[PDB]
Design a protein around this ligand. Structure first.
Ligand SMILES: *NS(=O)(=O)OC[C@@H]1C[C@@H](n2ccc3c(N[C@H]4CCc5ccccc54)ncnc32)C[C@@H]1O
Ligand SMILES: [Zn+2]
Lengths: 79, 527, 429
C-alpha cells in the first residue's frame, strides 16, 4: 500500500534505499539493511531525528515519512 | 624482538602492513602545528623515516601552538627543531631535515621529491601549492595538501591512480553460493538426510545445510524458480519451521540451528553477483589492454576477468570463509573445508591465468607469489581503484567542477563554503602579500577587501553561488590562526590517509576533505 | 608567558564574530582568567588521555588534573606518546604530568595515581569541566552517575550552577566517538547506553564442547581448563599481563584446536581473546581527543556554541563523520528525577526482581543490591558485593509479600556500575 522509500546512511556514509510501510517494525528495517549490505541487525543502531530507534516499535511512531534519512551509529568502548 | 610494542595496530594492518610502513619515507613540508601533528601520528606507529623541509625560523607564536617546538626553539630553524623532538617519540624512526624552502627546492632540485613514498605539504600559499602539485603530478609522487585556517580543516589528496586489493570493508554479504552451488558442495549436501537422523545430529546440523536441503524441496515442490519476493521467503521460513522435530508430549523442540536458518533466509538466498564496482574494473581500459608495462594489480585484475569467462561459469572465485553458526565441531569443520578447498582450488586456477598473461608480458611466472594470490582471491569482491583529479584540473577555468560546488551550495552552510572562503583568502593573500585580519589594526577594512576577493574568485570561474557575509567576517576573525585542536584533528585524519597510501590497505578519501571545528561537521568533495 | 605564545588562542577571546555563543563577551582578560582559574579534570592518561592533556595545555588551560589507575605497559607505546620505554612499570598519571609540565612551560598538570572510585563527590564537585578518555563502559557509567549525583534540585527544579559538563570520548580501531553531556539537561551516558555494540560472548555449551572457531578453544582454556587444572599454583588467578600464563593457554589451545581440527590459534589471537583487546592506533585517538578538547575550550570560554551532543567518526573507507543531538530519555534510570516503575506479582520470588535488574536492556546492572524500609530500620533484602552479607541474605531470594513489601513501596538499588542509589517504585498486580 504505502510504499515509502526511506534512505539509510551507513557508518561509512554509503546511502541505501529501502521500501517500507508505516506499520513495519524497526526489526524489519534492520533486516532490509542486512539484505543489501550484510550488516547484522544485532550490530545496527538506527538514529532518526535524535531518537534511538527501538526494534519493537514501528516506523509510524518515529514519524518516518517519505524521503526520510536514517543514520546508523555506534558508541565505542575503548580509549 | 619487541613486536609487543606494535601489538594494537598489528591487529589492524598486520605484519605485511607493518613492514610496508617501516620501509616508507615521508616528506613533510612546513613543520607548523598541522605538520608535526600529522607527523607525530606516523612516527608513533613506526614510519620508516622522514624528512622535514622547512626554511623558517621558530616564531614566538610557533612555540605556542606546537607540541614539538619549545620556548628554546625561538630563533632556530623550524625543520631542525621539530625533528629533534619528533625523533624522541620513536627511536626506530629515522629523521632528517632540510633548511631550504619548498620554492627554493623546486628551483634547484625538483628531482629531490622522487625519493619519497608520500609528500605531505602543509600551510602552503596558493602559488607554491600549484607549483608543487604540478611537479609531483608529472613525477607521479603521491601528494597530500593539508591546511589549518581558523576552525576550518582541509586536505586534498592527489594520486593519479591508487589501486587497492585489501580494502578491509566493515561489512559484506557472505559468499555462500547456495543459489548456484559448486559440484563439491552439492556432494556434501546430499551426504545429509534430514528425516533419517539421530537426536543431537538433527539439532547440530549447520544452518547452511539446512537451508540447502529445504531449497531442494522448494525447487522440487515448485518445479521452477527459487524464493524471490518477500511473500515467498516468508513461506520458505514456514516450510523450514515444519522440519523442527516435535517430542513425546507434542511440542516442537528448541532447535536453534533451525531458528538460525529461519533468520538467515534474509541474506543467504542472495543471488551470487559480481559487484558493479568490480564490473567497472573489468571494463576499464587498463584491464582490457594488457601491455608489458602494466603493474602487478592490473595483471591480477585480468587473471580474474579471464576466470569469469572460463572456470567461474560467470562469477568470481569462492571466498572460502564462512560465518560462525550453530553446529557440532565435525559438521562445521567438514563444511568449512568444502568451502576452504574450493577456494584454494579457484586461486590455483587464477594462478594459471596469471602465467598465461605473463607469457604475453614476457616475465617469469613466479613474480607474483602464492601469498599475494590468496589475498587477491579472498578479496576478489573488495577491490577498489581510486583515481584523483590533478590540482591543475581543479583550478582550471575550463575544468572546475561547478556542478559539484553549486549543487552543494544549496545549503548555504554546507562545508563547501569553507573551501570557497579558503580560495578567497588565498587570492587575498597573493594580492596583498599577507592574510586577512592578522593584526587587530587590519580586521575592519579587511572584511571589505576580502569580500572583494571572494566576488572576483566567484566571477572568474563563473560561479553564481551566494556566500553569507558572516563567513567573510568569520574568516577575518580567524586572522590566519592555526588553533592546535583544529590542527590535531587534521593531524589524525591526514596521518591515516598517508598510512593508507603507504600500506595500500584500506580506502583513501577521494579528493577534498573539509572539517569545520565550529559545527564539528565534516564532508568529502570530489573537486 | 613569552611574546606571541598565545596568539593562536587570543583571536577567539579578544575578537567578536558572527558564530559565537550568545553569552560571549570579547575581552583581553578572558585568557588570563582561563589560565589562572579554570579547573579542568582529565580522566584517563591513556591513548585518549595523553592527547587531551596536550590539547588542553596548548589551548590555554593550565589548572589541569589527571586520574589514571594503570601502570605503563610496553604496548601503550604505539600511541601513548607521553611515555618512553624507560618508563615501563611507572604510573601513567605521574609520567604524563611529568612530561607535560616540562614540555609546556608553567603548566600545572596534577597527577592522581588513583581509581576514580577512590574519590567521592566532594572531590569532583570542584572542577568546572570533566573530560574523560576511559577504558570501558562500566567506568563511563560510574562517572556519569557521580556527576548527576552532584546536581542540586531545590524542590523539583534544577540549580544550573550545580551542573558539571562531561565530555566523553571513546575509540575502537578506525571508528571513534565524542559526546558533550550536561547532567540533568541533555542525554547522559545511560540515556544512550544501548548504543554500544554487543559485547559478544559465547554460549557456555559451545565453549564446553562444541567449538567451531579458534577463539572458542582459547575461551575453553580461559574459563574452564584454567580453573580445572590450576596450573600455576592453586589459588593463583589468571594474570592476562604475564607472558608465562599466556604461553600456557596458547599451547593448551593448540592441543584443543588440533583435536577438533581447528586452524587459527595464534599467540596474538590468544592474547586478544583473553584480554579482550581493542585494536588501537594514534591517528583515530588524536581525532577524537581533539574534538573533545575543542569542546572543552568552547564550553569554558563561550567562544562558540558547543557540539550539540554526539559525533561518530569512521576512517576505514574514506572519511566519514555524523553529528547529532541525542535525545534525553524521560525514563532514564540515571539522570531522570522520579523513581523507576516496576510491576510484579505479590507472589514473585525476589530472584525475579534481581533477574529483571540484571537483564533489562535499559537497566543492565551487573551485581545489584536491593534495600527497603521494612518495619522500622532500613533492611538489606539482598547484597552481593560483601560475601559476608551475600550469605546472611541468600534465602531471601524466595518470597515479595512474604518479605513484607507493599504495593507502592520504593526499593533502594545499589550496583558497581554507579555510585548512585537508584530508586524503584514497586507495583503489585
Ligand atoms: N583507552 S586506553 O588508553 O587503552 O586506556 C585508558 C584507561 C583509562 C584508565 N582507567 C580505566 C579505568 C579506570 C578507573 N576505574 C575503573 C576500573 C574498573 C571500574 C569499575 C567501576 C568504576 C570505575 C572503574 N579509574 C581510574 N582510571 C581508569 C586506565 C587506562 O589508561
Ligand atoms: Zn539519562
Amino acid at each position: 500500500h504505502h510504499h515509502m522509500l526511506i534512505k539509510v546512511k551507513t557508518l561509512t556514509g554509503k546511502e541505501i534505499e529501502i521500501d517500507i510501510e508505516p506499520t513495519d517494525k524497526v526489526e524489519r528495517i534492520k533486516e532490509r539493511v542486512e539484505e543489501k549490505e550484510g550488516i547484522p541487525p544485532q550490530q545496527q543502531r538506527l538514529i532518526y531525528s535524535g531518537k534511538q530507534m527501538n526494534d519493537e516499535k514501528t516506523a509510524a511512531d518515529y514519524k518516518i515519512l517519505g524521503g526520510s534519512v536514517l543514520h546508523l551509529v555506534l558508541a565505542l568502548r575503548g580509549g | 624482538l619487541k613486536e609487543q610494542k606494535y601489538d594494537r595496530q598489528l591487529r589492524l594492518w598486520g605484519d605485511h602492513g607493518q613492514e610496508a610502513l617501516e620501509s616508507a619515507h615521508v616528506c613533510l613540508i612546513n613543520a607548523t602545528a598541522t605538520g608535526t601533528e600529522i607527523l607525530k601520528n606516523l612516527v608513533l606507529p613506526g614510519i620508516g623515516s622522514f624528512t622535514i623541509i622547512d626554511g623558517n625560523q621558530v616564531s614566538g607564536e610557533d612555540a605556542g601552538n606546537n607540541f614539538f617546538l619549545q620556548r628554546s626553539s625561538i630563533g632556530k630553524n623550524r625543520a631542525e627543531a621539530a625533528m629533534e623532538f619528533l625523533q624522541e617519540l620513536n627511536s626506530d624512526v629515522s629523521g632528517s631535515f632540510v633548511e631550504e624552502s619548498p620554492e627554493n627546492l623546486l628551483d634547484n632540485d625538483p628531482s629531490f621529491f622522487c625519493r619519497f613514498t608520500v609528500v605531505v605539504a602543509t600551510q602552503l600559499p596558493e602559488s607554491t601549492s600549484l607549483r608543487l602539485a604540478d611537479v609531483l603530478w608529472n613525477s607521479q609522487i603521491p601528494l597530500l595538501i593539508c591546511r589549518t585556517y581558523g576552525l576550518v580543516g582541509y586536505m586534498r589528496i592527489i594520486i593519479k591512480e591508487h589501486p587497492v586489493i585489501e580494502s578491509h570493508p566493515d561489512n559484506a554479504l557472505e559468499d555462500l553460493r547456495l543459489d548456484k552451488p559448486f559440484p563439491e558442495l552439492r556432494e556434501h549436501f546430499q551426504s545429509y538426510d534430514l528425516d533419517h537422523m539421530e537426536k543431537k545430529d538433527h539439532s547440530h546440523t549447520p544452518w547452511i545445510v539446512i537451508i540447502a536441503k529445504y531449497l531442494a524441496q522448494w525447487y522440487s515442490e515448485t518445479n521452477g524458480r527459487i524464493p524471490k519476493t518477500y511473500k515467498e521467503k516468508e513461506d520458505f521460513r514456514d516450510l523450514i519451521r515444519q522440519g523442527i522435530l516435535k517430542n513425546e508430549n507434542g511440542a516442537p523442540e528448541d532447535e536453534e540451528n533451525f531458528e538460525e536458518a529461519i533468520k538467515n533466509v534474509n541474506t543467504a538466498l542472495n543471488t551470487t553477483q559480481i559487484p558493479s564496482s568490480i564490473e567497472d574494473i573489468f571494463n576499464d581500459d587498463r584491464c582490457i589492454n594488457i601491455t608489458k608495462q602494466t603493474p602487478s594489480f592490473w595483471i591480477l585484475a585480468r587473471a580474474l576477468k579471464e576466470f569469469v569467462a572460463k572456470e567461474g561459469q560467470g562469477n568470481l572465485p569462492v571466498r572460502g570463509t564462512i560465518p560462525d553458526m550453530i553446529a557440532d565441531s565435525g559438521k562445521y569443520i567438514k563444511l568449512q573445508n568444502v568451502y576452504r578447498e574450493k577456494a584454494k582450488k579457484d586461486a590455483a586456477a587464477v594462478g594459471n591465468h596469471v602465467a598465461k598473461l605473463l607469457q604475453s608480458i614476457g616475465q617469469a611466472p613466479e613474480s607474483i607469489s602464492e601469498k599475494e594470490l590468496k589475498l587477491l582471491c579472498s578479496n576478489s569482491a573488495f577491490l577498489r581503484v581510486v583515481r584523483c583529479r590533478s590540482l591543475a584540473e581543479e583550478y582550471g577555468l575550463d575544468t572546475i567542477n561547478k556542478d559539484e560546488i553549486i549543487s552543494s551550495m544549496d545549503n548555504p552552510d554546507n562545508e563547501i563554503v569553507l573551501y570557497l572562503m579558503l580560495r578567497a583568502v588565498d587570492r587575498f593573500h597573493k594580492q596583498q602579500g599577507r592574510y586577512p585580519g592578522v593584526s587587530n589594526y587590519q580586521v575592519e577594512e579587511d572584511i571589505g577587501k576580502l569580500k572583494s576577493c571572494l566576488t572576483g574568485f566567484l566571477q572568474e570561474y563563473g560561479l553564481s553561488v551566494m556566500v553569507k557575509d558572516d563567513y567573510v567576517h568569520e574568516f577575518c576573525r580567524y586572522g590566519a590562526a592555526e588553533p592546535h585542536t583544529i590542527a590535531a584533528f587534521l593531524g589524525g585524519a591526514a596521518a591515516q590517509e598517508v598510512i593508507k597510501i603507504i600500506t595500500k590497505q584500506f580506502v583513501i578519501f577521494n579528493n577534498t576533505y573539509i572539517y569545520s571545528g565550529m559545527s564539528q561537521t565534516s564532508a568529502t568533495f570530489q573537486l | 608567558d613569552w611574546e606571541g605564545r598565545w596568539n593562536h588562542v587570543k583571536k577567539f577571546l579578544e575578537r567578536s564574530g558572527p558564530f559565537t555563543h550568545p553569552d560571549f563577551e570579547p575581552s583581553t582578560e578572558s585568557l588570563q582568567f582561563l589560565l589562572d582559574t579554570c579547573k579542568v579534570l582529565v580522566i584517563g592518561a591513556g591513548g585518549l588521555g595523553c592527547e587531551l592533556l596536550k590539547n588542553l595545555a596548548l589551548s590555554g588551560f593550565r589548572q589541569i588534573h589527571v586520574i589514571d589507575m594503570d601502570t605503563i605497559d610496553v604496548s601503550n607505546l604505539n600511541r601513548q606518546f607521553l611515555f618512553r620505554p624507560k618508563d615501563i612499570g611507572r604510573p601513567k598519571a605521574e609520567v604524563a604530568a611529568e612530561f607535560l609540565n616540562d614540555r609546556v612551560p608553567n603548566c600545572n598538570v596534577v597527577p592522581h595515581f588513583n581509581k576514580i572510585q577512590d574519590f567521592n563527590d566532594t572531590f569532583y564537585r570542584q572542577f568546572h569541566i570533566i573530560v574523560c578518555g576511559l577504558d570501558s563502559i562500566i567506568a563511563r557509567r560510574w562517572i556519569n552517575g557521580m556527576l548527576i549525583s552532584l546536581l542540586n534540585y531545590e524542590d523539583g527544579v534544577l540549580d544550573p550552577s550545580s551542573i558539571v559538563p562531561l565530555i566523553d570520548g571513546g575509540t575502537e580501531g578506525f571508528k571513534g566517538n565524542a559526546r558533550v553531556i550536561l547532567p540533568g539537561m541533555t542525554a547522559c551516558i545511560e540515556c544512550t547506553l544501548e548504543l554500544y555494540p554487543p559485547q559478544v560472548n559465547f554460549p557456555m555449551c559451545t565453549i564446553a564442547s562444541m567449538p567451531r572457531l579458534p577463539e572458542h578453544c582459547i575461551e575453553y582454556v580461559r574459563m574452564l581448563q584454567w580453573p580445572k587444572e590450576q596450573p600455576f599454583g592453586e589459588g593463583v588467578p589468571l594474570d592476562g599481563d604475564d607472558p608465562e600464563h599466556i604461553q600456557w593457554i596458547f599451547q593448551k589451545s593448540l592441543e584443543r584446536a588440533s583435536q577438533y581440527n581447528i586452524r587459527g590459534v595464534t599467540y596474538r589471537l590468544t592474547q586478544g581473546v583473553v584480554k579482550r583487546i581493542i585494536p588501537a592506533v594514534a591517528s583515530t585517538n588524536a581525532v577524537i581527543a581533539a574534538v573533545c578538547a575543542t569542546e572543552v575550550f568552547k564550553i569554558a570560554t563561550s567562544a562558540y556554541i558547543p557540539l550539540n551532543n554526539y559525533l561518530v567518526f569512521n576512517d576505514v573507507d574514506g572519511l566519514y563523520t555524523y553529528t547529532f543531538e541525542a535525545e534525553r530519555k524521560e525514563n532514564c534510570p540515571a539522570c531522570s528525577q522520579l523513581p523507576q516503575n516496576i510491576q510484579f506479582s505479590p507472589s514473585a520470588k525476589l530472584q525475579e526482581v534481581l533477574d529483571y535488574l540484571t537483564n533489562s536492556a535499559s537497566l543492565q546492572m551487573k551485581s545489584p543490591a536491593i534495600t527497603a524500609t521494612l518495619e522500622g530500620k532500613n533492611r538489606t533484602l539482598y547484597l552481593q558485593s560483601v560475601t559476608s552479607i551475600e550469605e546472611r541474605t541468600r534465602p531471601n531470594l524466595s518470597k515479595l509479600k512474604e518479605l513484607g513489601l507493599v504495593d507502592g513501596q520504593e526499593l533502594a538499588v545499589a550496583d558497581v556500575t554507579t555510585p548512585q542509589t537508584v530508586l524503584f517504585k514497586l507495583h503489585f498486580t
